Design an enzyme around this catalytic site. Structure first.
Site, short mmCIF file in Angstrom:
data_model
loop_
_atom_site.label_atom_id
_atom_site.label_comp_id
_atom_site.label_asym_id
_atom_site.label_seq_id
_atom_site.Cartn_x
_atom_site.Cartn_y
_atom_site.Cartn_z
N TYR A 190 34.72 37.62 32.34
CA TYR A 190 34.01 38.42 33.01
C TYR A 190 33.34 39.44 32.09
CZ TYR A 190 33.48 43.03 35.66
OH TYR A 190 33.11 43.99 36.32
N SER A 220 30.55 38.07 30.34
CA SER A 220 29.33 37.85 31.05
C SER A 220 28.71 39.36 31.23
CB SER A 220 29.65 37.31 32.31
OG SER A 220 30.24 38.07 33.11
N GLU A 236 36.82 46.65 48.54
CA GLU A 236 38.02 46.08 49.05
C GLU A 236 38.69 44.90 47.97
OE1 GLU A 236 39.30 44.91 53.15
OE2 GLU A 236 38.62 43.10 52.32
N1 LIG Z 1 34.25 47.91 41.82
C1 LIG Z 1 34.59 48.05 40.63
O1 LIG Z 1 35.77 48.32 40.27
C2 LIG Z 1 33.31 47.61 39.51
C3 LIG Z 1 32.39 46.74 39.72
N2 LIG Z 1 31.58 46.53 39.26
C4 LIG Z 1 30.28 45.61 39.42
O2 LIG Z 1 29.78 46.08 40.70
C5 LIG Z 1 29.19 44.90 41.37
C6 LIG Z 1 29.53 44.69 42.82
O3 LIG Z 1 30.85 45.09 42.84
P1 LIG Z 1 31.66 44.96 44.27
O4 LIG Z 1 30.75 45.41 45.38
O5 LIG Z 1 33.21 45.48 44.00
O6 LIG Z 1 31.89 43.30 44.32
P2 LIG Z 1 32.34 42.46 45.58
O7 LIG Z 1 33.44 41.56 45.22
O8 LIG Z 1 32.92 43.64 46.85
O9 LIG Z 1 31.13 41.66 46.42
C7 LIG Z 1 30.06 41.14 45.27
C8 LIG Z 1 29.28 40.35 46.34
O10 LIG Z 1 29.03 39.11 45.48
C9 LIG Z 1 28.98 37.84 46.43
N3 LIG Z 1 29.26 36.86 45.70
C10 LIG Z 1 30.39 36.45 45.46
N4 LIG Z 1 30.58 35.09 45.01
C11 LIG Z 1 28.86 34.75 44.96
C12 LIG Z 1 28.47 33.56 44.61
N5 LIG Z 1 28.88 32.51 44.16
N6 LIG Z 1 26.96 33.61 44.86
C13 LIG Z 1 26.40 34.68 45.39
N7 LIG Z 1 27.01 35.60 45.77
C14 LIG Z 1 28.26 35.87 45.58
C15 LIG Z 1 29.83 38.52 47.50
O11 LIG Z 1 29.32 37.70 48.80
P3 LIG Z 1 30.18 36.26 49.04
O12 LIG Z 1 31.58 36.24 48.75
O13 LIG Z 1 30.04 36.30 50.68
O14 LIG Z 1 29.22 35.28 48.52
C16 LIG Z 1 29.77 39.95 47.66
O15 LIG Z 1 28.48 40.26 48.65
C17 LIG Z 1 29.54 43.57 40.37
O16 LIG Z 1 28.52 43.44 39.58
C18 LIG Z 1 30.72 44.22 39.56
O17 LIG Z 1 30.91 43.45 38.34
C19 LIG Z 1 31.40 46.78 37.55
C20 LIG Z 1 32.64 47.71 37.44
C21 LIG Z 1 33.62 47.86 38.26
C1 LIG Z 2 38.54 41.27 38.35
C2 LIG Z 2 37.85 41.72 39.32
N1 LIG Z 2 37.34 41.14 40.44
C3 LIG Z 2 36.37 41.96 41.19
N2 LIG Z 2 35.76 41.81 42.41
C4 LIG Z 2 34.86 42.90 42.70
C5 LIG Z 2 34.68 44.06 41.95
C6 LIG Z 2 35.27 44.24 40.78
C7 LIG Z 2 36.31 43.18 40.24
C8 LIG Z 2 37.26 43.21 39.05
C9 LIG Z 2 37.38 44.02 38.02
C10 LIG Z 2 38.38 45.30 38.60
C11 LIG Z 2 37.91 46.69 37.98
N3 LIG Z 2 36.79 45.92 37.24
C12 LIG Z 2 36.23 46.69 35.75
O1 LIG Z 2 35.28 46.28 35.41
C13 LIG Z 2 36.89 48.04 35.46
C14 LIG Z 2 38.19 47.75 34.67
C15 LIG Z 2 38.67 46.54 34.26
C16 LIG Z 2 39.83 46.22 33.86
C17 LIG Z 2 40.66 47.30 33.57
C18 LIG Z 2 40.41 48.63 33.92
N4 LIG Z 2 39.19 48.67 34.55
C19 LIG Z 2 36.66 49.30 35.89
C20 LIG Z 2 36.04 49.07 34.89
C21 LIG Z 2 36.45 44.86 37.59
#
Ligand SMILES: NC(=O)C1=CN([C@@H]2O[C@H](COP(=O)(O)OP(=O)(O)OC[C@H]3O[C@@H](n4cnc5c(N)ncnc54)[C@H](OP(=O)(O)O)[C@@H]3O)[C@@H](O)[C@H]2O)C=CC1
Ligand SMILES: Cc1[nH]c2ncccc2c1[C@@H]1CCN(C(=O)C2(c3ccccn3)CC2)C1
Ligand SMILES: NC(=O)C1=CN([C@@H]2O[C@H](COP(=O)(O)OP(=O)(O)OC[C@H]3O[C@@H](n4cnc5c(N)ncnc54)[C@H](OP(=O)(O)O)[C@@H]3O)[C@@H](O)[C@H]2O)C=CC1
Ligand SMILES: Cc1[nH]c2ncccc2c1[C@@H]1CCN(C(=O)C2(c3ccccn3)CC2)C1
Lengths: 264, 264
Positions: A158, A161, A196
């Site tokens: 991750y 990327s 979630e």
């Molecule tokens: N929350 C956090 O702790 C942090 C989040 N981020 C970044 O924020 C962004 C969103 O986070 P978050 O809302 O928590 O993530 P989620 O896991 O809640 O959802 C992200 C979306 O990605 C979709 N998705 C998953 N797999 C695929 C696929 N193969 N093709 C197309 N779509 C896909 C999901 O829909 P579906 O499964 O139905 O395809 C879902 O709607 C990401 O880029 C994450 O890296 C960055 C740092 C911290």
């Molecule tokens: C694995 C995984 N799957 C996910 N699906 C959806 C959203 C976030 C995630 C994640 C990690 C959890 C939190 N994420 C971070 O990038 C931060 C971090 C990373 C490592 C240790 C402390 N913090 C918050 C910055 C992304």
């Protein structure tokens, strides 16, 4: 300063919009009267959100579903999204492939698929969307992570990327700026967000404090509308400063003298 | 304090060693009196360098030819290499794809090519090599760019693969450390190097002063041997400081206090 009217009647794509942060951006954008086209793998999850979006005041809301591991889908999806809206003001790259925490051990196959979904499909979609964006002087939102600026154990793929996202889009960002293309690229660096899927993943492994996905969504939108280079959204106050990296800014400013101006 | 005697008789792998910086590192290791196995696509090009290495006094010298676009070659090369020498002390991942200066206009195929060879292959071989490197508590050297720490125009695909290296291998390092594995990971941050390729490639585009390839090579070998997290070689002195980024370090540090050791 920001006014939601800035997104009123504007054409906005959001990948990963069926849940989490990207669903919240769908709602906020819908409340501002934007046109939205959404996408993800789950056809039913996309349906409920578009349905909510329309109730929320969206000029128009369409989903297209698929997987962003397929680069063909990634590109053709942009093309349909520009045909449904008649243009494109804002491309928000947000989706990511199923991630877990764990020490890395021998995953050539995991690393690749992650790279394709978390990096390749972004580049695919940015370039496919760039002609329409150039016409509107639009903006891209590239959602990254502290783990795209610094490293944490148990997240090597991750993290590879996200770093790749900064390297690549930051370069696109300067190049646009130097060739006078008025398209902005916002790198949105974020800490732990209480989606979630993040909490389930950190459960029993990381004990940090999470920030609310709703407000997070908000700063992402406002930051990109305001054509900012980077957004930092994290709980701690001492995050944007220890992540400031004043040296990188200095080097990037001078490095330009190395170049033949005619090239630009 | 580095002592060349340190590497007499050690087993080293060098990639992209048929020319440029890679070739220099092979020469040097040979004078130190180490065993080497070289690789790259050029069959005869590889032969000249082995013949030369043996003339300089290499303990041993063999080569395996192939493209690092094929992950199967990448794993299997490390296996044949390991057999040939009966083990491994130092893996040097150095090769990169053909690289030109230009504003971004690649299609996805090309960008995948960049990330496979420049990045994916590095992950593949370090994974394959890890067991021997544990067996010998050896070291890994990852050849990066200033472009892997800050951004320069016209090099976004390249800069992405580079940024992807720092992210990944920095993570692995931390993970090896919290789990008490005695394998070290040395990220080498190079400035402009007067190798044939880069010089004619920056011809008419970049006017910077190059660093000498012979020294560059040695500075790589010294650092990896001393087991440094990072090596900085560039004609400007004020460079390593600006790229210091102490905040990231401070932050990667406290980050472990949010983890559970049961994962160690
Ligand atoms: N929350 C956090 O702790 C942090 C989040 N981020 C970044 O924020 C962004 C969103 O986070 P978050 O809302 O928590 O993530 P989620 O896991 O809640 O959802 C992200 C979306 O990605 C979709 N998705 C998953 N797999 C695929 C696929 N193969 N093709 C197309 N779509 C896909 C999901 O829909 P579906 O499964 O139905 O395809 C879902 O709607 C990401 O880029 C994450 O890296 C960055 C740092 C911290
Ligand atoms: C694995 C995984 N799957 C996910 N699906 C959806 C959203 C976030 C995630 C994640 C990690 C959890 C939190 N994420 C971070 O990038 C931060 C971090 C990373 C490592 C240790 C402390 N913090 C918050 C910055 C992304
Ligand atoms: N020169 C500079 O100014 C700087 C260099 N660097 C880094 O230094 C490292 C060495 O660069 P440099 O010596 O200047 O470049 P060279 O072009 O001289 O050497 C690159 C090597 O990689 C090989 N190679 C190319 N493609 C493949 C492939 N698909 N599979 C396997 N091997 C391949 C080449 O051999 P063959 O074509 O026969 O396969 C060649 O031996 C690179 O990682 C670069 O990023 C970093 C900053 C600056
Ligand atoms: C194009 C090209 N083909 C190559 N084939 C082989 C080796 C290097 C290169 C290269 C560039 C030349 C310089 N490279 C850099 O990464 C640095 C840089 C980049 C941009 C502007 C100032 N410096 C030195 C950091 C790599």
């Amino acid at each position: 300063e920001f006014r939601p009217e800035m997104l009123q009647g504007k054409k906005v794509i959001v990948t990963g919009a069926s849940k989490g942060i990207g669903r919240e951006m769908a709602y906020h954008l819908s409340k501002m009267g934007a046109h939205v086209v959404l996408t993800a793998r789950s056809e039913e999850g996309l349906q409920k959100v578009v349905s909510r979006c329309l109730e929320l005041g969206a000029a128009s809301a369409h989903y297209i579903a698929g997987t962003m591991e397929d680069m063909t889908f990634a590109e053709q999806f942009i093309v349909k999204a520009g045909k449904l809206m008649g243009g494109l003001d804002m491309l928000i790259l947000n989706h990511i492939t199923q991630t877990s925490l764990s020490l890395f051990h021998d995953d050539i196959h995991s690393v690749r698929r992650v790279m394709e979904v978390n990096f390749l499909s972004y580049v695919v979609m940015s370039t496919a969307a760039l002609p329409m964006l150039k016409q509107s002087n639009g903006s891209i939102a590239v959602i990254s992570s502290l783990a795209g600026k610094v490293t944490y154990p148990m997240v090597a793929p991750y993290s590879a990327s996200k770093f790749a996202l900064d390297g690549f889009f930051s370069t696109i960002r300067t190049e646009l700026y130097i060739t006078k293309v008025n398209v902005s690229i916002t790198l949105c660096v974020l800490g732990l967000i209480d989606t979630e899927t993040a909490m389930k993943a950190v459960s029993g492994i990381v004990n940090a404090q999470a920030s609310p996905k709703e407000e997070c969504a908000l700063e992402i939108i406002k930051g990109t509308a305001l054509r900012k280079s980077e957004v930092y959204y994290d709980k701690s106050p001492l995050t944007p400063i220890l992540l400031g990296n004043p040296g990188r800014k200095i080097m990037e400013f001078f490095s330009l003298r190395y170049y033949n101006k005619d090239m630009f």
